[PDB]
Every structure is written in C-alpha cells, then in structure tokens.
C-alpha cells in the first residue's frame, strides 16, 4: 500500500510503499520465420482469384526484398547474437535444429546457447499448402477462402517487414506482430529463470514489451530470423521510493532539491533513476531500467529525514526564480505559491476548498480533485493511500540573501555551505 510523506522543511514528498522490478540483464531469443524461395506462379490465366494470389505473392516477395535491403548500448546483447548468426554455417544450425520441432536451443560459435523458436513457416504453407492448390493447367483456384487465408498467413510477415523498414531493423517496444502475447507468455515460461521472475513478467507483459527490443538479424537461406531482447529482472520486491521536489523560496532566494526521481534498494545500495522515462510504474511495482541508474550508498535516504545529515551530501539548486508552480505527486500535490499568483485546491462538488498562502504547501488527494496554480489547472492523482504531513521549519529561512549563492544549476548542501563560508570569509 502506497504511503506519502511531505516534508515542509525541504518542500519534498516521498511516495513510499512501492516494490522494485529492476532490469539488470537481457535475455536474447531468436525468432525465425521460414520463407519460401518461390519466384512466381508458373501459369498465367484469367482467373480473378489467382490474380489475387499473385498480388499477395508480390506482397510476399517485396517483403522479402525489403528485408534483404536491411551511457551504455541497449541492443548490444541482441546485436551480438545477430552478428553470430551472420557467420558461415550458423544459419544451418538453426535450420537443422528446427527441422522437426518449433522450439530448440542452438549452441552458436561463441558457445552461447540461445532458445530458437519458429513462430511461422511460410515455406511450408506456400510450397505445400498453397502451390498444390493452384491448378496449373487451368491456372484457377477452386475456392476464395484460399485467398483469404493466404492474406492472413502473409499478414504477419508484411507487418514485421513494415516495422523493420521504418525502424531501420531495430524496433522497440516489441509489437504483437514480432511476438504475440501467447508467444511472449510461453517465452517467459521457457526462460531459465526463477519462478518469482516468471510470475513478475507474466503479470506485467505490457511492461515487458515496452522494455524489450527486436533486432532484424538474417534473411539468408530461406530463413527470416530476428533476435528478441527480453528484459531480465534480477532485483524484485525491494523497497522503492519516489522523491518529488518543488521550489522552496522565502516570502527572495529559492532552493530546490535536484535529486528527484525513483530510488530503489539494490544489493545493499540505492539505485537512483533520474530520468522519468526510465521507470514504468504499475499498481505498486516500479519497473526501472538499471542502465539509466546511479548507484548510491544507503545513506541517501537520510536526506529525507535530515537535510543536514553528515552521512550524505544532498543535492540542491539555488536561484532567484520566484515562480509559483505545483508538483502533482502520488497521493497528493505539492503547491508552491509565490508572488501575486493565486493558488487554490478544489473539489468536484464543494468547489474551492483551500486557498494556498505564500510558501510551499501540500494537499492530499482526499477531498482535493484539482489544483489551480496561476493560470494552470492541475488534476491530482486519485491513488488510494495514506498521506502524512511532516511539519517543520523550511531550510531556506536559515540562510540570508546577502551571501546566498543563488545561481547554482546543480550543487549540494556542503557545496553551498562552503561557498557561503567563502563569502563570509571575504566579508
């Protein structure tokens, strides 16, 4: 259950009660589509249905022809597998492995073993189930349903080609054409991972797609194979807390804690994720990619309870930009009201239920439905949870404008204090 704590001292709110799902690795699987080497239907005729088949075959052939024309690094794992498949003889390993089965584990040249699955076999359908239907002597097809089912089978290839063409062979998220939900669910079950990870990934397949990649690998020897790069969640169920920060100004000099974003416990240390796009959030599970993470000591949590703790140097910025704004946190909203701008909190039925005075203040999502700051109307999150207000004297009142260095784009508590002490030393 989610719990929010607003700290009036630093105008920051921490939304605890979350559980982690941190992507610490990648799982690369090879998805193969066996392609027919057909060039055309041999006969020519005036049948309208066969012309539709030829039109669909032209779509098929053009799709194959289109495919043949094709900090960290997010696809380094799938690119590595793709480059191995380009080596001589590695395609025939996949061809022989999937000769009698649709799933196989293939040991490549590097020694890595990758699970290979054949999700579609157009070579079988076209050569064995489509071409024998065509009466070459009359160049006619008996039933129209053959045309319709050919369009359905070929449709997945056309959409896979369509996505690779516009994404230059690397698509993210992995769509349902690359890997259907049943295939993705079965693929997760087939991964050599613990049951806790399988339960986590199966319940959140929509998050798995958003964090996955599809890499077009080979189009050679009647095989269309692309590497799907699924995420591995090695860290699960560890506590997470999101730090929401809003400007804190005198009522002038402003102060804002810059270290906002998600924090999660990881192997005795705190993984900090500054970018907002990094972490996807579910009911109470936070899916943060560790590639965009900073590893911090566990003492980083002490900045919430004590901004002047000696165990850590909390990051803040200093400026004179006394502009009113509101941060719509979970279970509430931080409202910073300054100047002549009027800030109010409103309810759907009762209307304006609170008028914010000058300073930084917090309103829970209970009762409040919208927040108005200046000319901007903010809607608050209606998540169920318990919000806690921690009253305290704002830290911005301890400084003085004469020596406050109000130009730090990114600094820390100790850096500001040392720079202040330098100002006092000169003065």
């Amino acid at each position, epitope marked *: 259950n989610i719990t929010e704590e607003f700290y009036q001292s630093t105008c920051s709110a921490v939304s605890k009660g979350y559980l982690s799902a941190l992507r610490t690795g990648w799982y690369t699987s090879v998805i193969t589509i066996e392609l027919s080497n057909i060039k055309e239907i041999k006969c020519n005729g005036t049948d309208a249905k066969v012309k539709l088949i030829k039109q669909e075959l032209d779509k098929y052939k053009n799709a194959v022809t289109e495919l043949q024309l094709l900090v960290g690094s997010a696809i380094a794992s799938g690119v590595a597998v793709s480059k191995v498949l380009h080596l001589e003889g590695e395609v025939n390993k996949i061809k022989s492995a999937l*000769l*009698s*089965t*649709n*799933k*196989a*584990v*293939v*040991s490549l040249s590097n020694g890595v*073993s990758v*699970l290979t*699955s*054949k*999700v*579609l*076999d*157009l070579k*079988n*359908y076209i050569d*064995k*189930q489509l071409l024998p239907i065509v009466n070459k002597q009359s160049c006619s097809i008996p039933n129209i349903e053959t045309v319709i089912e050919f369009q359905q*089978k070929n449709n997945r290839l056309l959409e896979i080609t369509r996505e690779f063409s516009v994404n230059a062979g690397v698509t993210t998220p992995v769509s349902t054409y690359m890997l259907t939900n049943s295939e993705l669910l*079965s693929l997760i*079950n*087939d*991964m*050599p991972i613990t049951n806790d990870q399988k339960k986590l990934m199966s319940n959140n397949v929509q998050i798995v797609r958003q964090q996955s990649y599809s890499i077009m690998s080979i189009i050679k020897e009647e095989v269309l194979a692309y590497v799907v790069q699924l995420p591995l969640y090695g860290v699960i169920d560890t506590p997470c807390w999101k730090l929401h920060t809003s400007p804190l100004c005198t009522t002038n000099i402003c102060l804002t804690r810059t270290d906002r974003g998600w924090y999660c416990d990881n192997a005795g240390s705190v993984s900090f994720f500054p970018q907002a796009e990094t972490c996807k959030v579910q009911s109470n599970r936070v899916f943060c990619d560790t590639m965009n993470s900073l590893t911090l000591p566990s003492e980083v949590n002490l900045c919430n309870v004590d901004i002047f703790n000696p165990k850590y140097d909390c990051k803040i910025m200093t400026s004179k930009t006394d502009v009113s704004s509101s941060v719509i946190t979970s279970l509430g909203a931080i409202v910073s009201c300054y100047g002549k701008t009027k800030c109010t909190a409103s309810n759907k039925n009762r209307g304006i239920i609170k008028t914010f005075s000058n300073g930084c203040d917090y309103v829970s999502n209970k009762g409040v439905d919208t927040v108005s700051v200046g000319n901007t109307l903010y809607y608050v999150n209606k998540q169920e949870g318990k919000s806690l207000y921690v009253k305290g004297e704002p830290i911005i009142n301890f400084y003085d404008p004469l020596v406050f260095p109000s130009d730090e784009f990114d600094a820390s508590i100790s850096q500001v204090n040392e720079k202040i002490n330098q100002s006092l030393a000169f003065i």
Partner: antibody
Amino acid sequence: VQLVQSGSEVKKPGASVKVSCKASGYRFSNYGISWVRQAPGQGLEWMGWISAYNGNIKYVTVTTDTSTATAYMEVRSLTSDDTAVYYCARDVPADGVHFMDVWGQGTLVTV
Amino acid sequence: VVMTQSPLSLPVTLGQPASISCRSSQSLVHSDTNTYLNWFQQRPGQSPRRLIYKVSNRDSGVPDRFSGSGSGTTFTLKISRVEAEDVGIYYCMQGSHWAPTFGQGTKVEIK
C-alpha cells in the same frame, strides 16, 4: 547421440524405484527428457517431461542432473500395475512440440 | 488428443506393400502451418526409433521404402516393400499439443 538407462529392477509393492538415463553424444542442456511407459501387451504411454534448459516439468518425480548429463524418474508407491518398461527420449528443451528422436534401451521395472 | 491407429495387426507377405493409417481426434496443424505427426518403429527387443518426423519427412538413415502421407486429422504410413527388417510395432505420435500421445500400435507380421 545415444541414451543408456539403468538395468532391470525388481521391487515389492509400496517401494520406490528411480530409473536413470545417461546421455552422450550431444549437449544435454540443449534438450529435455521425456519418459514413456510401456506396459507388457500395452502401447506406449507418455509419463512426464523435464527440461535440462529450464528445469520445467510436465506430467512420479522427474529430475535431471546436468553435471553428469543424467535424467532420473522416481515412481513412488509401486503397484503391480506399474510393471512396465520405462524409456527416456531426448525431447524439446522448452514448451514446443515434442519429437523424441533418440530413445534409451529401456528399463524393465518389475513389481 | 486421441490418436486412433488402424489396423492393430498387419500381417504382410514379403515384398508386398503395407499401409498403416492413424487418424487424430483434432486437427494437428500447429500455429505455424506445420503438422507435427511422427511415426516410430519398435523392432522386437529394441527401443522405438523414429522413422518419419513430419507427415512425410523421412528421418536420417531410414530407407526410402517408408513413405508418410496425410493431412489434417487423417494420416497414412506406407511401406513400398515389406522386408524381414520391417517386422515390428509402429506408433504414430503427435507432439503439437500439450501432452504427446501415441497410437495403439500396429503389429506387423509376415505371412
């Protein structure tokens, strides 16, 4: 590529017998093992499948030892109806289609 | 998936052809257009060996006399010329569905 099983076993009802299956000629971890029962005068019957890649199990307790490339099947509460030949077949490593290309010579368990 | 197999006994004169049919209760066409139907042979005193691994694909080392045919729910195994080494029990198997199932088996003899 071959599979060799344990010798014939004679047991009394209510006991437990663990058949083994030693693999050679291929990478054990790239496949799974399917166990098939053949009662005398009766057709083949699929019992269970264990993957050497995932550890996944389908259906008696089947286990695989990757280090020794050996698969085990233990049948508990043996009855007179459990007198049959038990085969191990190399199978799909994941939830695909089963093929059972290579079979062990067969362990005759008598109860 | 019940794999009905017919006939159960197939006494065949040497050199004459033999046909074994095996009809499934459901269509064996998988999500991918393949139909994973296997044919096994159990030589007397030996473990079953795979002959045909998809409806018509002979396995490596299988003589050309063994031909597989069929589609959908009905399948056929044919031997062009029955020799002394063709005596055995033949099982059709499907691996497409969750649980592999075998046929009742066909006992081929010599008249």
